Design a protein around this ligand. Structure first.
Ligand SMILES: *[C@@H]1O[C@H](CO)[C@@H](O[C@@H]2O[C@H](CO)[C@@H](O)[C@H](O)[C@H]2NC(C)=O)[C@H](O)[C@H]1NC(C)=O
Ligand SMILES: [Ca+2]
Lengths: 143, 48, 100, 119, 222, 48, 48, 158, 50
């Protein structure tokens, strides 16, 4: 009978930012090169994925909400990537970890409504986008 | 001065034409299809 | 001189900075004479010779051509390990099995 | 076949009343004469794609959006005259000044970009 | 030959306008009238000459007073210009401060030699061996010149012009990566010396190019 | 290419800018009834 | 050639969804904050 | 002394000092003559002294607690204090070659004193200052959008 | 470089390859000059084209 309210509701939100920071100091060296910082960051990512996994069973009581659906996807894909990476374009599958900073938008309703108001102003522009698509197709065929 | 003045004047005149054209369509750009409009009257004419 | 060229062939040296290394080694081998003994080795998490010599050679026109050809055929891949690279280089200068 | 079926069904005198059917004649006549020359030759072959908009523009959510803007561009034709006048005046002025600059290949004043001719 | 042929067309064309300008003066005796006498006047006086050849581009502007629609559209432009004159005084004053800041930051730091091996004016002299397209087997002898950048921040005017070019969003990455390499007062660049100097360009672009230009269009719309 | 830039870019950018500016006015006139301008007006009037 | 040409959809989504947000972040501010300046001015011109 | 502050001969005299402050900043150039830096750095101290005397006059003439309500006076006294700080800093054993150029920017802000009385500019400034919680909220979402795509590019093309 | 009596070099471009790969002989010549007049011996090179 797990209960959630405000005890860690800011703790997990700050952990999201800490993981975003840890994703910014990882230098992608060419041709599978690396240094000590990346070596430590791999073990830090292990611990960061542990916390996210530990917070998917307590928030399971959710399974249909879009935000929670993405939150569960960016955890299950990370677990699958870790599992299949340990038993070895594997390194390109960890590109789902950049959606974790996007998780922070749902934690702040004040900033969450702004994004909703931005997407809700995109429906009227769909006709113009559809017109642009036909113009592109016609000009490509003419060329 | 030739190129700077041309790039300033041309941009100002192009946005002047854009906003001038947009001004003529505030009836359609703020139509509010929900309540009423000439589209309903056209539909009525075709049905009649 | 008993020269021994250590070449970094790790991942980070791929690209323009490897073409500069291969040219630098080629121009460096031109400052050696028949009284000089040289060998070329490369390390990327594992140190190995870039050619068939495995030890110091007289660095004459015949031997320098082989080293130059092998240097122009190296590739960049892997991680960097200076501890393994320098141990390999220090071991080849302590050989004394052959003429130096 | 579609054209010959519509003409004998829509009383040709009235068939040219519609603007869509009259503009569809050129493509059909254009496409029927290119086949005979397959064994000056692309003028009609190029307009074979123009039949797309003749029926993929019937949605009255994108056609009215176009029409309300084309019908507004011609309602203000003197505004584009200012842009035309500005272009003419600046092109003519640049012609005397920078029209004698040499045409090289590695510069920005080259065979494709120069002030030598009014176009 | 075309100029000579077109030279006879103006002969006749200028006669007509002299006939009409005197014809109207018979029945009259606005600033729009002086321009008509000026356009035909510059073609007459021309009969240095380079300035009079350029000053006769006023011919298409003689139809402003002879078209009601064109005159009304022209007057609306000057009506709108005076209204947008408040935001022009602000975006010009704000650009001047950024130009002064850029003068303080990169005042004479955009110098470089022809070959990227000499990093001061003393060594950047004489000839040097240039290798085409990176090939070490195709050398060519070239002269090394210690030359400035095309868009520099030496004074407040060059800085203002470079900032204008940046605010037009054209060629600004080149200036950004040239300013990041800016090492010192009179010495050559170093690859990625101060990446953190990009904050100046980012702030300028956000404040002027993105904000001050969109506020202009919005104000016109309102 | 010249007709592609005029139609593809200049025509479309006019459409995008106009339609977007018609939604801003639509969302401003609807929020005017709430009293957002009233709160700004009373605070500005209570300063001088 | 090969299948490396499909990664061009990264620079297309970024340019399309980036230049669209910039018109909802820098134009939506000038037509909702400055649109009030005129209102204020007009309201301050009638109370003065 | 309020009769020498709320007058027309003092506001129109402060504008001249502000203009002379802008003139000494918008005059530096590469390889400037040695005689120009002397004028620049003597006008520096002299005009800074005049500005701090003006601040002392406009600090104890109407009320000290009513000045903090106005944002401009608190903003301008900050610039005055910063300016008086560096005069001894430069002349003392703190050279800071990069610190000399950075502060001139922080001391060239005194040009906003010619835009205080607009009534056509501040009317929209007061409107955009009220919507700061939305202005800084749209920007923080644009920054988050830029961060995610930068992190994604760091993986694909790193 | 100098914890082991050596010297450090920069080669940022092709133009610096020719000069920086021959300056290591200055360091190697330090013990020869400090020897004094015992290092002033005449040597003869291999046969080469002038
Ligand atoms: C030659 O090199 C080897 C290895 O580098 C030296 O080591 C000995 O090699 C010989 C033959 O392989 C054997 O005696 C042993 O395997 C090695 N160790 C010892 C203690 O002998 C060897 O000393 C060098 N010299 C000679 C003459 O072989
Ligand atoms: Ca490395």
């Amino acid at each position: 009978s797990i209960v959630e309210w405000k005890p860690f509701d800011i703790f997990i939100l700050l952990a999201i930012f800490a993981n975003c920071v840890a994703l910014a100091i990882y230098i992608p060296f060419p041709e599978d090169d690396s240094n000590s910082t990346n070596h430590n960051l791999e073990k830090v990512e292990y611990a960061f994925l542990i916390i996210f996994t530990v917070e998917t069973f307590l928030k399971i009581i959710y399974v249909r909400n879009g935000w929670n659906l993405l939150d569960f996807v960016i955890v299950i894909v990370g677990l699958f990537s870790v599992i299949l990476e340990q038993l070895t374009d594997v390194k390109a599958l960890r590109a789902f970890r950049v959606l974790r900073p996007l998780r922070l938008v749902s934690g702040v309703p004040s900033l969450q409504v702004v994004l909703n108001s931005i997407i809700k102003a995109m429906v009227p522009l769909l006709h113009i986008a559809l017109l642009v698509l036909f113009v592109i197709i016609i000009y490509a065929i003419i060329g | 001065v030739y190129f700077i003045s041309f790039y300033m004047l041309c941009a100002f005149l192009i946005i002047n034409l854009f906003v001038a054209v947009i001004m003529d369509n505030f009836d359609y750009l703020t139509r509010d299809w929900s309540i009423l409009g000439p589209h309903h009257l056209d539909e009525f004419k075709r049905i009649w | 001189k008993d020269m021994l060229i250590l070449v970094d062939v790790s991942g980070s040296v791929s690209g323009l900075t490897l073409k500069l290394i291969r040219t630098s080694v080629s121009e460096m081998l031109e400052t050696l004479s028949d009284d000089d003994f040289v060998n070329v080795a490369s390390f990327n998490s594992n140190a190995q010779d870039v050619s068939c010599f495995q030890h110091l050679v007289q660095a004459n026109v015949r031997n320098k051509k082989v080293l130059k050809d092998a240097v122009n055929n190296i590739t960049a891949k892997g991680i960097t390990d200076y501890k393994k690279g320098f141990s390999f280089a220090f071991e080849q200068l302590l050989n004394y099995n052959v003429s130096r | 076949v579609e054209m010959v079926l519509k003409v004998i069904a829509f009383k040709p005198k009235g068939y040219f009343s519609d603007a869509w059917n009259t503009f569809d004649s050129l493509i059909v006549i254009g496409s029927i004469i290119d086949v005979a020359l397959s064994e000056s030759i692309t003028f009609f072959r190029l307009f074979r794609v123009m039949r797309l908009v003749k029926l993929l523009s019937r949605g009255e959510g994108i056609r009215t959006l176009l029409w309300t803007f084309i019908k507004s561009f011609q309602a203000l034709p003197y505004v584009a005259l200012l842009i035309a006048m500005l272009f003419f005046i600046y092109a003519v002025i640049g012609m005397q000044m920078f029209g004698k600059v040499a045409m090289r290949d590695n510069n920005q004043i080259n065979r494709n970009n120069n002030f030598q001719t009014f176009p | 030959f075309r100029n000579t042929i077109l030279g006879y067309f103006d002969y006749a064309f200028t006669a007509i306008f002299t006939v009409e300008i005197l014809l109207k003066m018979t029945t009259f005796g606005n600033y729009f009238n002086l321009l008509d006498m000026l356009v035909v006047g510059v073609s007459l006086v021309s009969f240095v000459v380079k300035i009079l050849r350029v000053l006769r581009v006023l011919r298409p502007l003689r139809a402003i007073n002879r078209a009601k629609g064109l005159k009304h559209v022209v007057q609306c432009v000057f009506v709108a210009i005076r209204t947008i004159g408040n935001i022009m005084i602000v975006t010009t004053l704000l650009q001047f401060m950024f130009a002064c800041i850029g003068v303080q930051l990169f005042k004479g730091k955009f110098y470089r030699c022809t070959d990227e091996a000499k990093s001061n004016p003393e060594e950047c002299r004489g000839l040097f061996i240039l290798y085409k397209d990176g090939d070490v087997d195709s050398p060519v002898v070239r002269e090394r010149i210690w030359q400035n950048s095309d868009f520099n921040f030496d004074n407040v005017l060059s800085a203002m012009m470079a900032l204008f070019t940046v605010s037009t969003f054209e060629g600004w990455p080149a200036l950004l990566y040239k300013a990041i390499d800016s090492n010192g007062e009179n010495i050559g660049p170093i690859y990625n010396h101060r990446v953190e100097i990009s904050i100046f360009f980012i702030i300028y672009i956000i404040i002027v190019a993105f904000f001050m230009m969109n506020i202009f269009v919005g104000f016109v719309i309102v | 290419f010249v007709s592609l830039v005029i139609f593809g870019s200049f025509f479309v950018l006019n459409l995008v800018l106009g339609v977007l500016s018609g939604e801003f006015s639509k969302e401003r006139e609807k929020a005017k009834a709430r009293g957002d301008f009233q709160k700004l007006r009373e605070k500005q009037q209570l300063e001088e | 050639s090969s299948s490396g040409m499909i990664v061009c959809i990264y620079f297309i989504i970024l340019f399309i969804c980036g230049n669209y947000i910039l018109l909802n972040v820098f134009l939506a501010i000038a037509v909702d904050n400055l649109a009030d300046a005129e209102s204020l001015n007009t309201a301050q011109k009638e109370e003065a | 002394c309020r009769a020498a502050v709320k007058s027309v001969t003092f506001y129109w005299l402060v504008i001249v000092l502000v203009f002379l402050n802008t003139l000494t900043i918008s005059s530096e150039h590469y390889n400037q003559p040695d005689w120009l830096t002397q004028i620049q750095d003597i006008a520096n101290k002299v005009l800074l002294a005049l500005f701090t005397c003006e601040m002392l006059v406009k600090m104890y003439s109407l009320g000290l607690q009513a000045y903090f309500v106005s944002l401009f006076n608190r903003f301008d006294c900050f610039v005055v204090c910063g300016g008086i700080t560096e005069t001894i800093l430069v002349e003392l054993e703190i050279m800071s070659p990069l610190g000399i150029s950075v502060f001139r920017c922080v001391r060239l802000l005194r040009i906003f004193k010619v835009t205080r009385h607009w009534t056509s500019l501040s009317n929209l400034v007061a409107s955009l200052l009220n919507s700061m919680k939305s202005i800084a909220s749209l920007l923080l979402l644009l920054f988050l959008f830029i961060i995610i795509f930068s992190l994604l590019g760091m993986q694909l093309f790193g | 470089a100098c914890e082991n009596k050596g010297y450090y070099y920069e080669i940022p471009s092709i133009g610096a390859i020719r000069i920086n790969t021959q300056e290591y002989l200055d360091v190697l010549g330090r013990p020869m000059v400090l020897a004094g007049d015992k290092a002033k011996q005449v040597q003869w090179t291999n046969v080469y084209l002038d």
